[PDB]
Design a protein around this ligand. Sequence first.
Ligand SMILES: COc1ccc(S(=O)(=O)N(CC(C)C)C[C@@H](O)[C@H](Cc2ccccc2)NC(=O)O[C@H]2CCC[C@@]23CCO[C@H](c2ccccc2OC)C3)cc1
Lengths: 99, 99
Amino acid sequence: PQITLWKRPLVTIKIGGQLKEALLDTGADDTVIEEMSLPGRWKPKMIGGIGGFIKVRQYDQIIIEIAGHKAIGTVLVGPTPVNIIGRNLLTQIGATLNF
Amino acid sequence: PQITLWKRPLVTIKIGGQLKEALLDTGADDTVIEEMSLPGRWKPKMIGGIGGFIKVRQYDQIIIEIAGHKAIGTVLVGPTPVNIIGRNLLTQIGATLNF
Ligand SMILES: COc1ccc(S(=O)(=O)N(CC(C)C)C[C@@H](O)[C@H](Cc2ccccc2)NC(=O)O[C@H]2CCC[C@@]23CCO[C@H](c2ccccc2OC)C3)cc1
């Protein structure tokens, strides 16, 4: 699709058998999802943003369907105000910024 | 142009007579720029992201040059580590996300 930016670019994603809504976020290197249960081993880690840092759990090799496109990558799980799909997954669905 | 996302989507902008490097950020509602003086009046605002909030100064009707386009709009100035071009200006340069 072609997504204009008059509204937040929210999409439906499928992760760990659950549907979620998430924001396509070209300004985020990594993907950060609100607290949820995922299978497999995770590592504790901290990440930062504009206001400070948060504690997250890092899951590797997670399959995610982003607006019906399949991708695999690392997902960080923690207390984010919005689920954000970062560049590590945007590249894998072939997303580009065009103007 | 068409900008892929294997690296950060950084561009040179001209604002307040100065050249700065900034991120084209679909996840940002507004544009947030590091501390500088701009020639206009400002109002206080607080914005929130991952980790908490920061206090910024809101300037209106600021002209910013982004790759052959001139956008005019609101700019938030505050303690951000990275200059962020948000949707309020991305719409004016006709930017879309495509996949
Ligand atoms: C109303 O207007 C606004 C309101 C809020 C915002 S916003 O900016 O809050 N946002 C909103 C989004 C979180 C919903 C835009 C988002 O695209 C930021 C941009 C940004 C880039 C660089 C530095 C700081 C902000 N990406 C980010 O937060 O990406 C972080 C989180 C995961 C990947 C990330 C990349 C940058 O390095 C981070 C990091 C890691 C370790 C240590 C310190 C760190 O960072 C200080 C990690 C804007 C406008």
